[PDB]
Amino acid sequence: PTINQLVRKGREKVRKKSKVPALKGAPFRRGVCTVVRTVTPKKPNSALRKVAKVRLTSGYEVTAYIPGEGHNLQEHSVVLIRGGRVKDLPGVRYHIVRGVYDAAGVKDRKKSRSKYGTKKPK
Amino acid sequence: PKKVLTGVVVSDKMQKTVTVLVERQFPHPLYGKVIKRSKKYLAHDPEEKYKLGDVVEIIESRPISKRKRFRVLRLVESGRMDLVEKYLIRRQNYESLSK
Amino acid sequence: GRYIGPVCRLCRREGVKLYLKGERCYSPKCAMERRPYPPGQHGQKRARRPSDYAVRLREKQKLRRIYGISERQFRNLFEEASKKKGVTGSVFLGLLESRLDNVVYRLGFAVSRRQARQLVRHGHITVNGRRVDLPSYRVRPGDEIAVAEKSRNLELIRQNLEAMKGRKVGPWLSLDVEGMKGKFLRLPDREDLALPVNEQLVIEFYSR
Amino acid sequence: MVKIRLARFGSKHNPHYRIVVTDARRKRDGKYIEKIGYYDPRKTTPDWLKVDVERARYWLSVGAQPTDTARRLLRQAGVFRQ
Amino acid sequence: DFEEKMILIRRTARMQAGGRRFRFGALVVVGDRQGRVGLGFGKAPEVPLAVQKAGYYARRNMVEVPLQNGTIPHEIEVEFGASKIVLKPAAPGTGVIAGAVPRAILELAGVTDILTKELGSRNPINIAYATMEALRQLRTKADVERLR
Amino acid sequence: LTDPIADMLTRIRNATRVYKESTDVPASRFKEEILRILAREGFIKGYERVDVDGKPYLRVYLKYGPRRQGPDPRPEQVIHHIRRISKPGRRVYVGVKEIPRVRRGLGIAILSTSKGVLTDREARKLGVGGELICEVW
RNA sequence: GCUAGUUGGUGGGGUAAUGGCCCACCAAGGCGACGACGGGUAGCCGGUCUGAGAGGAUGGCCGGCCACAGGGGCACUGAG
RNA sequence: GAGGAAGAAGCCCUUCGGGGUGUAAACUCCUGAACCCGGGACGAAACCCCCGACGAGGGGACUGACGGUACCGGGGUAAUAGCGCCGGCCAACUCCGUGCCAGCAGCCGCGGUAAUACGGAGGGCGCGAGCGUUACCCGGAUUCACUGGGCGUAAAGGGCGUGUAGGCGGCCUGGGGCGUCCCAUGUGAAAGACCACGGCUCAACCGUGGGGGAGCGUGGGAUACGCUCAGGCUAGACGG
RNA sequence: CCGAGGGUAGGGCCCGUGACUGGGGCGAAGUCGUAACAAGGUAGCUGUACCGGAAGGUGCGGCUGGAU
Ligand code: SF4
Ligand SMILES: [Mg+2]
Ligand SMILES: [Mg+2]
Ligand SMILES: [Mg+2]
Ligand SMILES: [Mg+2]
Ligand SMILES: [Mg+2]
Ligand SMILES: [Mg+2]
Ligand SMILES: [Mg+2]
Ligand SMILES: [Mg+2]
Ligand SMILES: [Mg+2]
Ligand SMILES: [Mg+2]
Ligand SMILES: [Mg+2]
Ligand SMILES: [Mg+2]
Ligand SMILES: [Mg+2]
Ligand SMILES: [Mg+2]
Ligand SMILES: [Mg+2]
Ligand SMILES: [Mg+2]
Ligand SMILES: [Mg+2]
Ligand SMILES: [Mg+2]
Ligand SMILES: [Mg+2]
Ligand SMILES: [Mg+2]
Ligand SMILES: [Mg+2]
Ligand SMILES: [Mg+2]
Ligand SMILES: [Mg+2]
Ligand SMILES: [Mg+2]
Ligand SMILES: [Mg+2]
Ligand SMILES: [Mg+2]
Ligand SMILES: [Mg+2]
Ligand SMILES: [Mg+2]
Ligand SMILES: [Mg+2]
Ligand SMILES: [Mg+2]
Ligand SMILES: [Mg+2]
Ligand SMILES: [Mg+2]
Ligand SMILES: [Mg+2]
Ligand SMILES: [Mg+2]
Ligand SMILES: [Mg+2]
Ligand SMILES: [Mg+2]
Ligand SMILES: [Mg+2]
Ligand SMILES: [Mg+2]
Ligand SMILES: [Mg+2]
Ligand SMILES: [Mg+2]
Ligand SMILES: [Mg+2]
Ligand SMILES: [Mg+2]
Ligand SMILES: [Mg+2]
Ligand SMILES: [Mg+2]
Ligand SMILES: [Mg+2]
Ligand SMILES: [Mg+2]
Ligand SMILES: [Mg+2]
Ligand SMILES: [Mg+2]
Ligand SMILES: [Mg+2]
Ligand SMILES: [Mg+2]
Ligand SMILES: [Mg+2]
Ligand SMILES: [Mg+2]
Ligand SMILES: [Mg+2]
Ligand SMILES: [Mg+2]
Ligand SMILES: [Mg+2]
Ligand SMILES: [Mg+2]
Ligand SMILES: [Mg+2]
Ligand SMILES: [Mg+2]
Ligand SMILES: [Mg+2]
Ligand SMILES: [Mg+2]
Ligand SMILES: [Mg+2]
Ligand SMILES: [Mg+2]
Ligand SMILES: [Mg+2]
Ligand SMILES: [Mg+2]
Ligand SMILES: [Mg+2]
Ligand SMILES: [Mg+2]
Ligand SMILES: [Mg+2]
Ligand SMILES: [Mg+2]
Numbered sequence A: 001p002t003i004n005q006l007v008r009k010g011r012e013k014v015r016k017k018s019k020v021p022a023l024k025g026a027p028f029r030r031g032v033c034t035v036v037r038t039v040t041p042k043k044p045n046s047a048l049r050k051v052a053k054v055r056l057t058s059g060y061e062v063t064a065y066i067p068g069e070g071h072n073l074q075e076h077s078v079v080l081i082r083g084g085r086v087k088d089l090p091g092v093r094y095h096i097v098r099g100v101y102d103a104a105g106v107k108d109r110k111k112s113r114s115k116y117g118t119k120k121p122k
Numbered sequence B: 001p002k003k004v005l006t007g008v009v010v011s012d013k014m015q016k017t018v019t020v021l022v023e024r025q026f027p028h029p030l031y032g033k034v035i036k037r038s039k040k041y042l043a044h045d046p047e048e049k050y051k052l053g054d055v056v057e058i059i060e061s062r063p064i065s066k067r068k069r070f071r072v073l074r075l076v077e078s079g080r081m082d083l084v085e086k087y088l089i090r091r092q093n094y095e096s097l098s099k
Numbered sequence C: 001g002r003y004i005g006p007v008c009r010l011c012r013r014e015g016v017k018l019y020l021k022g023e024r025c026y027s028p029k030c031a032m033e034r035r036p037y038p039p040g041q042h043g044q045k046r047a048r049r050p051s052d053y054a055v056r057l058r059e060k061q062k063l064r065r066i067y068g069i070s071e072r073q074f075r076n077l078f079e080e081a082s083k084k085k086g087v088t089g090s091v092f093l094g095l096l097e098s099r100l101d102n103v104v105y106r107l108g109f110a111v112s113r114r115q116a117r118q119l120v121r122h123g124h125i126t127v128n129g130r131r132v133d134l135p136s137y138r139v140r141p142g143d144e145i146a147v148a149e150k151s152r153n154l155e156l157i158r159q160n161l162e163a164m165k166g167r168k169v170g171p172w173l174s175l176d177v178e179g180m181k182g183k184f185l186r187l188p189d190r191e192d193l194a195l196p197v198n199e200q201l202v203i204e205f206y207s208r
Numbered sequence D: 001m002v003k004i005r006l007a008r009f010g011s012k013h014n015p016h017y018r019i020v021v022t023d024a025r026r027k028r029d030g031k032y033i034e035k036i037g038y039y040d041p042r043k044t045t046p047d048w049l050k051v052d053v054e055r056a057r058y059w060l061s062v063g064a065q066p067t068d069t070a071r072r073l074l075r076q077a078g079v080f081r082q
Numbered sequence E: 001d002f003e004e005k006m007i008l009i010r011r012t013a014r015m016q017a018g019g020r021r022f023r024f025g026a027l028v029v030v031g032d033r034q035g036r037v038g039l040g041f042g043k044a045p046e047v048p049l050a051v052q053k054a055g056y057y058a059r060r061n062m063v064e065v066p067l068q069n070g071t072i073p074h075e076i077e078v079e080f081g082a083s084k085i086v087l088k089p090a091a092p093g094t095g096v097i098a099g100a101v102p103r104a105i106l107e108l109a110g111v112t113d114i115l116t117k118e119l120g121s122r123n124p125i126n127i128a129y130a131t132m133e134a135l136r137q138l139r140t141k142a143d144v145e146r147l148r
Numbered sequence F: 001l002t003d004p005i006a007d008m009l010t011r012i013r014n015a016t017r018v019y020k021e022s023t024d025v026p027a028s029r030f031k032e033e034i035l036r037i038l039a040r041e042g043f044i045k046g047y048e049r050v051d052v053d054g055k056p057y058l059r060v061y062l063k064y065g066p067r068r069q070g071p072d073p074r075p076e077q078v079i080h081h082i083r084r085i086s087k088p089g090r091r092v093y094v095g096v097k098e099i100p101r102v103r104r105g106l107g108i109a110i111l112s113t114s115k116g117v118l119t120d121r122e123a124r125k126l127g128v129g130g131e132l133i134c135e136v137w
Numbered sequence G: 001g002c003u004a005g006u007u008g009g010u011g012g013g014g015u016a017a018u019g020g021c022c023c024a025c026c027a028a029g030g031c032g033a034c035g036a037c038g039g040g041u042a043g044c045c046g047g048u049c050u051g052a053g054a055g056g057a058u059g060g061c062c063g064g065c066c067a068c069a070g071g072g073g074c075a076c077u078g079a080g
Numbered sequence H: 001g002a003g004g005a006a007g008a009a010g011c012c013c014u015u016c017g018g019g020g021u022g023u024a025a026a027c028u029c030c031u032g033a034a035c036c037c038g039g040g041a042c043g044a045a046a047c048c049c050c051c052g053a054c055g056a057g058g059g060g061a062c063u064g065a066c067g068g069u070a071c072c073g074g075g076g077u078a079a080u081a082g083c084g085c086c087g088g089c090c091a092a093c094u095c096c097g098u099g100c101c102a103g104c105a106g107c108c109g110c111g112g113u114a115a116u117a118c119g120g121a122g123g124g125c126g127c128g129a130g131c132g133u134u135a136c137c138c139g140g141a142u143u144c145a146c147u148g149g150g151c152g153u154a155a156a157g158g159g160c161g162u163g164u165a166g167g168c169g170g171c172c173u174g175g176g177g178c179g180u181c182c183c184a185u186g187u188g189a190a191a192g193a194c195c196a197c198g199g200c201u202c203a204a205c206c207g208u209g210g211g212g213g214a215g216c217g218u219g220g221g222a223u224a225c226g227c228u229c230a231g232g233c234u235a236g237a238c239g240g
Numbered sequence I: 001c002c003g004a005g006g007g008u009a010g011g012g013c014c015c016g017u018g019a020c021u022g023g024g025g026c027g028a029a030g031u032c033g034u035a036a037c038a039a040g041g042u043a044g045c046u047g048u049a050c051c052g053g054a055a056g057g058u059g060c061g062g063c064u065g066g067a068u
């Protein structure tokens, strides 16, 4: 644009859209599970990924991924969630943190334990 | 010191008070172009002796009313209806700017 | 704190000898003399071309491992040199060479910078008479790094100062042996120390 | 009344004062009217007190009122010597 | 002799019935670290051939860059197509602040202290080309006065 | 024609890119002072107040380098680059402390000051600033 | 598109003091695309984080100013 | 900490020859975090008291929460390590298990019976009383482009005129000096930032001193350019 | 007299929610046909209008970003 056009209208500073609206600005949110089931992923992957529908303290109800091998989560399981989509599970934008509230850690986990709420084995 | 401005009397339909349109220029803070801005001041005319179209000087003065904090200092030039029309023609263009 | 684990694996990784033990570093029992290839299962496999990032990282780890200093303190010394006046490369090595534990090593008080650290840390060293047990103390031109008087009758410092009675030091240093004390004359040049390190690569590493 | 006193600067277990003229209603370490030297109670540095006598006597001349130990440090500075 | 540095080795493909059949491209810069640098792009049916063929043209296409204390005389900006390169003189303690592609060309020509920036398309070929033409247009206070 | 100064810089630039011995621009006292500097700095051989069809012009005599050897005989320019800075749509003014150095020194910035049209080197000597007219190298 | 204490005047009240701050009357004015009016968000600054710079983001800790003291209204005492 | 085998066991890999963890361990000597006793602060000299005069000046005493802490001295034990990662970007590879399952995932993508990408193990890389994760800000993003971008076909010329405001505007001269430029001066608090020195054993932290700036007030000065006022001109434009 | 506010009445804006309903995105392992890409088997696209289970068809006018 001309210099006059810039004086008349300026440059638009465009805002960024949060990828985690259910968190309402927090790093984590506590919730309670309502549905605890498996969901098949999209092309070109095939599995039965473990997902929980969580009713958050922020008011939202969202679907969070349950990472690791096996879990202990059922309806009414208290749960902390964090940001993080699962690319291949459309609509899943959050992860449940293993090892907080009613989320157990992964059994017999040895590598990357801090990401799976598994304490050090003796 | 008491700030002094220069502008043209664009209204005088008040008793003992004229409306003086002051103009000013400065570079745009970011785009450097020289831009014009304008502001009206309610000017104390205690002798109703200044007329529509008079380029005058007003001086920052102790408050006379609500919005009147400037008295006319002196005449600078007379018969500037060419400037008073620009102001009025803009105000007349506003009716077309609605819905 | 500092790295305390196996130290020959460092040299074997860096492809050069870093004199991280003193005595055995000159023997035929030195690891680089027997196995001059990186540690681990794949050390004797044919190396593939390293990325430019690998190169600059390796040089940086070579320079850092020499002083046995933490990446934190390393990077902070570097950042000071970058904001300092003139050429960052020289100043970086200069501020490196000005550490108390490093000067204690250069003076032959200790056979390794590790030994020097334990000497300083255990308070067996003074600076201008004033006792200092801080390995990270910055020595300045005109100082004086002496053995603690209450420690002069120590086997290790004895044998080490024996072996230094007429050994040269850096031009930027002097050492009155038998008196167990030396002087820090000036901050060194890169010329004064032929460390197997191109330092510009370390600049380039931190400029990414 | 404007006063002349020590606003503490420095750090914990390391006090360093600025002998200062300020409104008595100001907070201790708040905006001061003027600085008229420093004070170091621990005598670390080998010149742990200083006073701009050309000014400190003015502030007395014009009305200011030093505190007890500000006065004493103004005494060891010779603002009262006749 | 001249030091060489491979910058890019890519494999292109072309289609026929029966399938695709490949070919390799080598971006090589050569120089002495003293004021002489050349760039050549080599294509051949196998990697070593293309690499060697690239070193050949690099010597057949050189440029003398007016080094002054290890920096360039004046700042320059050149566009090659949609790629833009920026070079700015820099003092002793600086280094060569440049992406991998322009770094190789400045380093081998003896530049030790320069600020750079790629803008526009960052295609390595067009960026390598744009760096050569930037060096090629550098001028000394001499040539300035010679022209006037 | 909204910017005679940029029209003259462009007349030169269009003329030098086809290697003309000269090209004529409509004349004015401010233009001559600008050409006065292009000569005194060697960007041009000089000018002369000619007339065309009864109208006062400025015939600017261009200057190039030696012929070259290779596929492109065309010789290097002397004015590689000349462009307007301050414009009717955006006046540009610098004080003496912010006067830029064209091409590290090998180039000239042309200013208009209340001590007349001056180079950036001239302007720094006299210690004045002004409207940054253009830059040349 | 906005405006009836609304904009100006005369008189008086009121204050430490100017003023529609308040009141009575007189006049019909005042403001707006250079964004009035309305909606939303926010205490502002020294500074802070980042950035080659320009800029972007931010105002917790310390310093300055403002505002508030369960939600509102009010005056009394008083140099305040 | 030094020394310490062509190199123990165990575990991992192997073409079964051997290779690795690895001077790493064991072992030897040296030092001595912790803790055990001795002493133990700086911050505190004023107000007051006496002589002087209820002043100048001089002399006298009381007082430490932190604290029996810091610290000094004497002795004195080898004395916590963990976290992430190793398909590419990106530094670091092998064996087994699994077999589009279980699972990984920042992006591209991994897994369908020889997976450097899943899970473990050995090994390796990176940091270290921390290491990773999530959220958010600036950066990379010249990806709102003033510096520093674009619009035939990539996203992008208004369907076309006419025209209001506004933005912008030819050659020469003079007046004014609004913009603009220069000089002087006031303001630009302290802290912070920066350079130097110094005080805590270093540093963090802190003290002392040093240099500015924009911006705005004021006085003075310049007049090329832009603006304004005045007078000319005909190359734009309009008319005959 | 003014006056916190309470009360009566009538307007304006915003949020949450609602039997039911409209289309949209995604999933994909289905049913129907095959509209577009080749002259895509009726050159295509297009504003509008009327029509058809559906992609779409046809009329009128326009475009070439149409093969021969
Ligand atoms: S013995 Fe050799 S490998 Fe081991 S630390 Fe000394 S120099 Fe390095
Ligand atoms: Mg809940
Ligand atoms: Mg798959
Ligand atoms: Mg339960
Ligand atoms: Mg994420
Ligand atoms: Mg891990
Ligand atoms: Mg993992
Ligand atoms: Mg009045
Ligand atoms: Mg050595
Ligand atoms: Mg390299
Ligand atoms: Mg530097
Ligand atoms: Mg001892
Ligand atoms: Mg060495
Ligand atoms: Mg950086
Ligand atoms: Mg007291
Ligand atoms: Mg040359
Ligand atoms: Mg390109
Ligand atoms: Mg381009
Ligand atoms: Mg230079
Ligand atoms: Mg691009
Ligand atoms: Mg790319
Ligand atoms: Mg510009
Ligand atoms: Mg009145
Ligand atoms: Mg009062
Ligand atoms: Mg009012
Ligand atoms: Mg009334
Ligand atoms: Mg009326
Ligand atoms: Mg306005
Ligand atoms: Mg707007
Ligand atoms: Mg609100
Ligand atoms: Mg940028
Ligand atoms: Mg804010
Ligand atoms: Mg905050
Ligand atoms: Mg605050
Ligand atoms: Mg309130
Ligand atoms: Mg209240
Ligand atoms: Mg409360
Ligand atoms: Mg209350
Ligand atoms: Mg050992
Ligand atoms: Mg062997
Ligand atoms: Mg072995
Ligand atoms: Mg073995
Ligand atoms: Mg073994
Ligand atoms: Mg004791
Ligand atoms: Mg004490
Ligand atoms: Mg007392
Ligand atoms: Mg006395
Ligand atoms: Mg002890
Ligand atoms: Mg012992
Ligand atoms: Mg041990
Ligand atoms: Mg990591
Ligand atoms: Mg693979
Ligand atoms: Mg990395
Ligand atoms: Mg790698
Ligand atoms: Mg299974
Ligand atoms: Mg397998
Ligand atoms: Mg991985
Ligand atoms: Mg694995
Ligand atoms: Mg630490
Ligand atoms: Mg953390
Ligand atoms: Mg960003
Ligand atoms: Mg940006
Ligand atoms: Mg632009
Ligand atoms: Mg673009
Ligand atoms: Mg058109
Ligand atoms: Mg339209
Ligand atoms: Mg105009
Ligand atoms: Mg003009
Ligand atoms: Mg004039």
Ligand SMILES: [Mg+2]
Pocket (backbone or CB within 6 Å): none
């Ligand atoms: Mg004039």
Ligand SMILES: [Mg+2]
Pocket (backbone or CB within 6 Å): H177, H178
């Ligand atoms: Mg002026």
Ligand SMILES: [Mg+2]
Pocket (backbone or CB within 6 Å): none
């Ligand atoms: Mg100033």
Ligand SMILES: [Mg+2]
Pocket (backbone or CB within 6 Å): none
């Ligand atoms: Mg300051």
Ligand SMILES: [Mg+2]
Pocket (backbone or CB within 6 Å): none
């Ligand atoms: Mg010190």
Ligand SMILES: [Mg+2]
Pocket (backbone or CB within 6 Å): none
């Ligand atoms: Mg500055």
Ligand SMILES: [Mg+2]
Pocket (backbone or CB within 6 Å): none
């Ligand atoms: Mg001035």
Ligand SMILES: [Mg+2]
Pocket (backbone or CB within 6 Å): none
């Ligand atoms: Mg005229």
Ligand SMILES: [Mg+2]
Pocket (backbone or CB within 6 Å): none
């Ligand atoms: Mg004509």
Ligand SMILES: [Mg+2]
Pocket (backbone or CB within 6 Å): none
């Ligand atoms: Mg005609």
Ligand SMILES: [Mg+2]
Pocket (backbone or CB within 6 Å): none
């Ligand atoms: Mg009411």
Ligand SMILES: [Mg+2]
Pocket (backbone or CB within 6 Å): none
């Ligand atoms: Mg009410």
Ligand SMILES: [Mg+2]
Pocket (backbone or CB within 6 Å): I005, I006
């Ligand atoms: Mg009530």
Ligand SMILES: [Mg+2]
Pocket (backbone or CB within 6 Å): none
């Ligand atoms: Mg529905």
Ligand SMILES: [Mg+2]
Pocket (backbone or CB within 6 Å): none
């Ligand atoms: Mg069809």
Ligand SMILES: [Mg+2]
Pocket (backbone or CB within 6 Å): I040
């Ligand atoms: Mg078809």
